[PDB]
Every structure is written in C-alpha cells, then in structure tokens.
Design a protein around this ligand. Structure first.
Ligand SMILES: *[C@@H]1O[C@H](CO)[C@@H](O)[C@H](O)[C@H]1NC(C)=O
Ligand SMILES: *[C@@H]1O[C@H](CO)[C@@H](O)[C@H](O)[C@H]1NC(C)=O
Lengths: 105, 109, 219
C-alpha cells in the first residue's frame, strides 16, 4: 500500500545542481502533504521541508511538487552534505517512508 | 528537552523485552497542530516506517509489537520482545521539538 | 418447460486491486463543507473487507444489500468522505430533518449505496480550543442531493439587516467533532454511491466461468 519509488544514486564531483525523484500510485486531490529528509552524515534523519516551506536552513532546495502522484523531485549546488540526502515520505496513507546522493571517485 | 534518548546498545537477551526512553521539553504538539509523538525503526541502511503515538493512546503500524509509557516529557517505548536479530535503531519525532531528532538501541549481541 | 443444464458467468477482464484503502486509511478528511467524491472505476471490487471491518461502527445500506455487492458490476462507484459529529451521524440519511442534510451533506432519498462511519477520537480530536471542522447553519433551499455548498459570506439568515457588514447572520463557525470529550466526537463518514448499469460496467468481484456456447439451455 502507497509504496514510494526512488531512482539510482547521483555521483558528482563539481558543485553542480542535482535532481532526484519519487513516484507512487494514487488518485488526484487538493491535499499536498508529501515531504523529504536527509540522512545527515553522522546524525539521524533530518527534514528539509514538507509543504513548500523550509526548516531552519538556507533555501537552496527546491520543492518541485504536484497533485496526484506528485511528481516530486532538488538542489542548486550540492557543495555540502551528499550522504544519501533525499528520502521521500507520504503523510497521506499509513505514514509511508522510503529512500541516493554522493561526491566521490 | 532536546529529544535525547537512552543509549541502549546490546543489553537485551534474544528472548527478552526491552525499553527505550527519550526526553522532550513539552508534551502536546504535532506538525498538523494536533497532539502527536512518532517513532521509526531500522538496523541497516534501509527504510523504517513511521509509527504514530498519541498523548493519551497506544498504536500499531506496520509492526504490532508496541506499547509504551509516553507519560510526560520522558516518553518511553516498550518493546514487548526483541526477537533475537530482528533489531534496529529507534528514533523519536516531534512536530515542534527539528521534527526528527535523536541518537538511535544498536544490536542483540 | 426445460430445465437449464449449464450456466454462464461472464465478467469483464479486470485485473486491478480496487484501492478502497486509499479512501479509508487517509490521514486527512474533509469537513462537512466538502468532500472529494473520489471516483473508483476499472477494478476488482471486494466489499467483504469493508463490510466485515472491525473498525466500523456503522454500515448502513439503502439500495444494494450489504450481503451482495460483490456480485454486481457497476459503472462507477463514488466515495464521499468527510468528518461529521456524533449527534448528526444518522442525520444525513433520507430522514433529512435534523438540520445537517439540508445545510451540509445530503444523501439522496433514492440512494443506491451504503454509508460507512466510525468512532475516531484518537485522530481529529483535541485537548482543547477549536479545530478544523465547521458546519452550515442556513442555505435557504435546503440543498440538492450531493450538493457542496462552500460559500461563506455574511448573510441575512435571520432577516436582520447585515448589509454586507454583520446579530444571527454571521459565518457558521461551529467547531464540531473534536471538542475534548457524543456531540464532539468525529466519525469520518464515507458514502459509497453506486451507478446501476448506465454504461458498460467496470467495478465488481473475482468471478468468471463460461465458454459462451449460446446453444444450450443455460442460466
Ligand atoms: C473476458 O475475456 C474473454 C476472452 O478471454 C472474452 O470472450 C469475454 O467476453 C471477456 N469478458 C467480457 C464481459 O467481455
Ligand atoms: C486500512 O489499513 C489496515 C492496516 O493498518 C488494513 O488491514 C485495512 O484493510 C485497510 N483498509 C481498507 C479499506 O483497505
């Protein structure tokens, strides 16, 4: 039930922007309460945002969100914190959570 | 005060119950403006599911083995039994206290 | 007459799961002002699960019996989902006299379906203060079946001269179904409306058995 689907990992050396994605089954609606976290490098999960607002950090992040199966995706530089930092969650049905990013080689 | 938790590591026998407590500064808030308390659980770099606990009531989610003395700012989860290696790290979440915050038991032995 | 010796069970070739749980396991429900009327189509509906759920306090059918349903193919099924207060749970019914059906959700008197509701006071409830669910006090038409009246304005309901600016003409900001406590309990009502073969059908249970012979006395 309402399983979330992610993509493969994104590997980049330069401080280029990156985009990630999340897909799921469903019907259209006015409700928009999907969100994102990061696994911070030596911390637990941390939330960046939910509805298109930001937690206590610089808004270098993008809330590319839509209705139905929200075409959820996003950062401008990736100059910090690359440790699989985009987990998708859907607080609509069963509070399902699932999740990616790296700077290496 | 800061969603800090008891450093339980390996002190659980494979056939025994276990419990983990954490501390908040207050008790009646959530992200949607209602009362809530949340828990997550995993050992490996996999995806934990989110379990909802109220300020006056018990839950079930994907897993069934939950109880817990969420009695005050000191909120305790009761693990009815740890089935040997079926272990994971536990985190507390509060809508108004970083949403997810904590230190994470570790293993069975 | 000649007794049939065989039978034909001919159902549409439907392979989908029929996600009623995306209506029933929702974290958010609409207030009595509006409902989503989610459309369910093209699925192998099984109403056994909803009927026998231990989570429901009521399951009232007006049209198709609760013991049937799986045997009928409908063109569409619609789910009208909203939060209602305990004292009004039965008042959306054809006995539309209690001042909810006529300002808020109105069930048709010829409704073909079933109404589902349950006590849910660990969700949508508060320790105190107001909450997210309001109500409608007047309409002056007493509504049409399935009408969603969401127009909020100062209105001279009391025939008192509230000429734009406000008295008994104010907004129906009732704060229902949560008041830390019947008459303050939320019930998450889901109404399932059914379309009784007005097009090729798309919603029904897991049955099939035929060779389509058409040359035998059959059922
Ligand atoms: C189901 O599929 C068979 C062919 O496999 C077809 O003959 C039948 O008509 C289909 N069901 C309906 C109601 O059309
Ligand atoms: C709602 O979720 C529960 C699992 O918590 C499941 O057993 C139940 O069948 C779901 N309800 C519906 C209508 O599918």
């Amino acid at each position: 039930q309402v399983q979330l689907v992610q993509s493969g990992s994104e590997l980049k050396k330069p401080g280029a922007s990156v985009t990630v994605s999340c897909k799921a089954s469903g019907y259209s609606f006015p409700t928009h309460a999907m969100n994102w976290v990061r696994q911070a490098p030596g911390q637990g999960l941390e939330w960046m945002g939910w509805i298109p607002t930001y937690a206590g950090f610089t808004g270098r992040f993008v809330f590319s969100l839509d209705t139905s199966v929200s075409t959820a995706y996003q950062i401008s530089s990736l100059k910090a914190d690359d440790t699989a930092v985009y987990y998708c969650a859907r607080g609509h049905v069963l509070e399902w959570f699932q999740g990616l990013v790296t700077v290496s080689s | 005060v800061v969603m800090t938790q008891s450093p339980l590591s390996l002190s659980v026998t494979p056939g025994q119950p276990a419990s983990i407590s954490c501390k908040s500064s207050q008790t009646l808030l959530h992200s949607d403006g209602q009362t809530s308390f949340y828990w997550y659980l995993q050992k490996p770099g996999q995806s934990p599911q989110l379990l909802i606990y109220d300020i006056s009531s018990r839950f079930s989610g994907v897993p069934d083995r939950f109880s817990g003395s969420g009695s005050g700012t000191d909120f305790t989860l009761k693990i009815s039994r740890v089935e040997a290696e079926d272990v994971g790290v536990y985190y507390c979440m509060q809508g108004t206290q970083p949403w997810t915050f904590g230190q994470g038991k570790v293993e069975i032995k | 007459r000649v007794q049939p010796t065989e039978s034909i069970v001919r159902f549409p070739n439907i392979t989908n799961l029929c996600p009623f749980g995306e209506v029933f396991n929702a974290t958010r429900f609409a207030s009595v002002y509006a409902w989503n009327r989610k459309r369910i189509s093209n699925c192998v509906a099984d109403y056994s699960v909803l009927y026998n759920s231990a989570s429901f306090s009521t399951f009232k059918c007006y049209g198709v019996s609760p013991t049937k349903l799986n045997d009928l193919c409908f063109t569409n099924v619609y789910a009208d989902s909203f939060v209602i207060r305990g004292d009004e749970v039965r008042q959306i019914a054809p006995g539309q006299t209690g001042k909810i059906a006529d300002y808020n959700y109105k069930l048709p008197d010829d409704f073909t379906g079933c109404v589902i509701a349950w006590n849910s006071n660990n969700l949508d409830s508060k320790v105190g203060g107001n909450y997210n669910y309001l109500y409608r006090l007047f309409r002056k038409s007493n509504l049409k079946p399935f009408e969603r009246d969401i127009s909020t304005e100062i209105y001279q309901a009391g025939s008192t001269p509230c000429n734009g600016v406000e008295f008994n003409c104010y907004f129906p900001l009732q704060s229902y179904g949560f008041q830390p406590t019947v008459g303050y309990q939320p019930y998450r009502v889901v109404v399932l409306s059914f379309e009784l073969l007005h097009a090729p059908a798309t919603v029904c249970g897991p049955k099939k058995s035929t060779n389509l012979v058409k040359n035998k006395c059959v059922n």
